Amino acid sequence: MKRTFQPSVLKRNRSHGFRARMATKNGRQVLARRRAKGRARLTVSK
Amino acid sequence: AVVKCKPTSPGRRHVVKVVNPELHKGKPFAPLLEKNSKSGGRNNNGRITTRHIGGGHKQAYRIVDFKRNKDGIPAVVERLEYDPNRSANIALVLYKDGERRYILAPKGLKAGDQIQSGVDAAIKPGNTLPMRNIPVGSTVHNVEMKPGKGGQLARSAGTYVQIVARDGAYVTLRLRSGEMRKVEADCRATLGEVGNAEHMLRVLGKAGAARWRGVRPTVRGTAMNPVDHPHGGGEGRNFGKHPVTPWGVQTKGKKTRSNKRTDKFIVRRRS
Amino acid sequence: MIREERLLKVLRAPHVSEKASTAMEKSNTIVLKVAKDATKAEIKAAVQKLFEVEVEVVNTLVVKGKVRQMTVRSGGRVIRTSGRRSDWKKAYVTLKEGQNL
RNA sequence: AGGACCGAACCGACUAAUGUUGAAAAAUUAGCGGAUGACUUGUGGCUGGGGGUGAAAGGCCAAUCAAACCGGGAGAUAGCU
RNA sequence: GCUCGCCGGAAGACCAAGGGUUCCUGUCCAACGUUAAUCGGGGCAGGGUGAGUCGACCCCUAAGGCGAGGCCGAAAGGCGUAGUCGAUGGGAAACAGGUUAAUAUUCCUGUACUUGGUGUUACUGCGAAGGGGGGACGGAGAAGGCUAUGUUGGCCGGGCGACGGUUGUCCCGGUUUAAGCGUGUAGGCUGGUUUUCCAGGCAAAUCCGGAAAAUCAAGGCUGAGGCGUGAUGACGAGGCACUACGGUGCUGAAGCAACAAAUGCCCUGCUUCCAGGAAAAGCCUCUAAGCAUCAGGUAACAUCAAAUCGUACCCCAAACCGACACAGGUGGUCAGGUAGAGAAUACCAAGGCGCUUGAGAGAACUCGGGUGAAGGAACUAGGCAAAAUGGUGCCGUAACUUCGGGAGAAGGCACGCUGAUAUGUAGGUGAAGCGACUUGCUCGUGGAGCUGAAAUCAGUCGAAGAUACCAGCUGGCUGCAACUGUUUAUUAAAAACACAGCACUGUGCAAACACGAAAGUGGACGUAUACGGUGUGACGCCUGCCCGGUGCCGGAAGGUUAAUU
């Protein structure tokens, strides 16, 4: 059966990547929270 | 000519098609084409704003001359062409200076005919004149609403407009709806009716024939649940309510026109 | 033209392997480790100057490093650590007729 | 010619049996329907929660849907256990 | 290592996506592996990915995104113009052999090709964010010409049989060879060439478009394949040597023809239909401003430059998505033989596997199957399940019907092998020879050779000849829905939804309506033969009476009636 995760690097980066987070102020607020928590990986960007 | 197909399968039993031998068979005139991407009835917000639109055949837009501005230069009709963007078909006309254009094909037009526009053009089908220069009682089409804007009225397949009166700066027209309307006498019109009057006689025959005109299925309101439509549920087939649109406005009789800016131009409303 | 300091930077080490030895003894080809950002023109100039040989052509590839795992003790306690070795660039330098080291 | 016919790929899911701490959080085996079309499929894109989308079943919206998920108001309130 | 078995339109081979060293070599067996393990996709160490031509990047744009100014909006922000991004699409060029334990169109050998820069020479009108061509486009169907590929013959090399026979209508194997360059033919399209003129191509043009005149239609574009060369080269059965028996080294015959051939190529063609089938750049061409013995353009030659990133390996799977070394899911490409209509099916090739617990036993019972006397639906809610039918050709086929259907209705019969007609027929292909011509990738005639159904007559074996696999059960009466379709991913596929058709109703375009505090956008680059809403649901015959109630439409005299005053 087809499962929900159907990976694609281009779609991954376009949806949750660093430049996508930086494009809006809500996404920029996501990054600030993750910096405050001290996350080792800020985004899915790799 | 309208032709009935033989019932060699269901889906062909009730198909009636309008066949036109004089329509061009080759490709259209390339310089007068543009792309026309489909919308699905979605606006720039991405939401369905008109229901039952989507799919259908790919179409290219043909730039049709609705203004008819080239005054005093005769044009000859090269060929009649099929146009997928409208019910009427169009004519490719060659002006004496070597420029080509598309116009709506009037009723009697055919290849070789001569057309002209302007104040001094002869009173013949396919000729475009200001309505100041057209005799009262004439049958015209592709009628301008504002001088120089381009034809807006009576553009469909079998439609036409009657000039019923001329009173000063305005002429009074009888529209296909039966409405009497005033327009400026400087607005242009083309003499004759639009051709392809057999358009209304075609029968699609099957569901798919409407799907490839880009029409999606219509679900009856009474077939839904109350959350989806005012014609809500019921155990079995219940209605018990006044008919309304999906947004709760009483259809089947309630008038919806509200335009005080324009009311001065409506001599009589349709009936 | 490439400055001499750049040339003294771009060459890292000869690369020793049986593929490298076979290449040298078959095709007169020299295999080196080079700076990861060294272009073929830079490698050509560097070999031609620092090794005093005449170079035919340079072929390059990037080698991705592997994950290496080993332990470090931090205050009377051994902890397992993991990390990736750094990438490096490998040059296949074909010599016209000279002899190298 | 055909929303034509029989029938593989391909797309479905009518019946039975098995399975039910499964090989599998919906499958397998034997049959079954469509199979040039209102078909099917890859790759991108758009629509966001009282909102979307729906050939309409309260269907689907990441194994979650008569109002998703995450965080917060928040130690809601609980004449009940 | 030898046998046996399984897949073979896959369980083989090559990728994309995704993964990320799983790849190859050496070592180890704790843990991991549903057992053991000397083995491993496990631990440790070392190695491995070579590009002007493949891909990315790059030039160009689709849907869409972002968007200087701008227009809107309490703020946040929304929309959008110029523009700029965005492939799943268009833009330049390499093939064949050899080689590593692990890479190859990348390394080597041989033979090529493309684009650009810079010089020299010769001849010269060059020059755009501008004009025009082109790129550039659907579905279906039908040839015809070919090729990949296959079969047989010839040729070459080998063989003479563990058991009767086997010096021959005998057996086994091989009979390969590319890009490029030259030629330009089966086919497809189109009249050509000059001269003059101009209300068109936002300006101007010698280009495109248009109008006349003359003169020849005998011209040009496009195009598979074949042929030549590439290639006295490479490869090549097999021998001859060494050996660590892994494997390495040397040499090397023939290397042709006929027939059959695609779903591949000609073909982005041709014919036909309606539902009427991207864009932009590269490319060709025309001029403007401008430049003027410059600069630029064309051609030849020379020379240089073609960077950077990917390249291992899996890839219908033990490397991806499913928590697992999970009977599931996953797009593209290739496709050999014998039967066969076939990519079904059976058995095989190349290739790959026996599915990571075994050994015995031969109870009940469960599961998956085979066969059953007599009976034959008596079973059961119900013929559920099973059994049965099943191919091709021919004969024959009712009611009813919207005249198409019903219909493979039903029901029958003939099917193997051998010989003859005919040492292989009808048909297909077609060589030499010969005749012409405009003189070779020519035409006509001819019929060698090859291939080759179907039928009839005669005979013959078996219980049985569509012998296996494969492969319709049929008929009668009725309810519902006209029909193909769609749906409750995961207990409901239906009589439900949709549907073509019908009706009512709204809407005059800045349309109604919908999404939006708005700007705007969809409706629609449409315009009443159009668009939205509602109900009904092919077709046929039809659709009666009621306006008291509730709605909607019209009217406004009168009564009542808000802010305000």
Residue numbers in the entry:
A (entry chain 6): 1 to 46
B (entry chain c): 2 to 272
C (entry chain t): 1 to 101
Describing publication, verbatim:
Co-translational folding is a fundamental process for the efficient biosynthesis of nascent polypeptides that emerge through the ribosome exit tunnel. To understand how this process is modulated by the shape and surface of the narrow tunnel, we have rationally engineered three exit tunnel protein loops (uL22, uL23 and uL24) of the 70S ribosome by CRISPR/Cas9 gene editing, and studied the co-translational folding of an immunoglobulin-like filamin domain (FLN5). In E.coli’s 70S ribosomal particle, the tunnel’s unique geometry is shaped by the 23S ribosomal RNA (rRNA) and the ribosomal proteins uL4, uL22, uL23, uL24 and uL29. Of these proteins, uL4, uL22, uL23 and uL24 all have extended loops (ranging from 10 to 25 residues in length) that protrude into the tunnel, and along with uL29, have surface-exposed globular regions that crown the perimeter of the exit tunnel.
Unlike the loop truncations, the extension of uL23 and uL24 loops showed opposing effects in modulating the CTF of FLN5: 23+L caused earlier folding while 24+L delayed folding. To investigate how the uL23 loop extension promotes earlier folding, we analysed both 23+L and WT RNC (L = 34) structures by single-particle cryo-EM. The electron density reconstruction of 547,000 and 614,463 P-site tRNA RNC particles were refined to an average resolution of 2.5 Å and 2.7 Å for 23+L and WT RNCs, respectively. Unlike the uL23 loop in the WT ribosome that primarily interacts with 23S rRNA H6, the extended uL23 loop interacts also with neighbouring H7 helix: the guanidino groups of R73 and R77 in the extended uL23 loop form contacts with the phosphate group of A90 (H7) and the ribose of C455, respectively, while both uL23’s T81 side chain and the G83 backbone are in close proximity to A64 of H6. The 23+L cryo-EM structure revealed continuous density corresponding to the P-site tRNA-bound folded FLN5 NC, which extended from the PTC throughout the entire length of the tunnel and beyond the exit, resembling the WT RNC structure. Notably, the folded FLN5 NC densities of 23+L and WT RNC (L = 34) both show only the H24/H50 pathway, making clear interactions with two rRNA helices (A1323 of H50 and C490 of H24); they do not follow the H6/H7 pathway. This is seemingly a result of the short linker (L = 34) that can only follow the shorter H24/H50 pathway to accommodate the folded FLN5, while RNCs with a longer linker (L = 45/47) can take either of the two. Unlike the folded FLN5 NC that follows the H24/H50 pathway, the available cryo-EM maps of different unfolded NCs with similar linker lengths (L = 30–40) all show their NCs primarily on the H6/H7 pathway irrespective of NC sequences, revealing the likely interactions between the unfolded NC and H6/H7. On the 23+L ribosome, however, this interaction face is occluded by the extended uL23 loop, which is highly positively charged and interacts with both H6/H7 rRNA helices, thereby reducing NC-rRNA interactions and eliciting early folding.
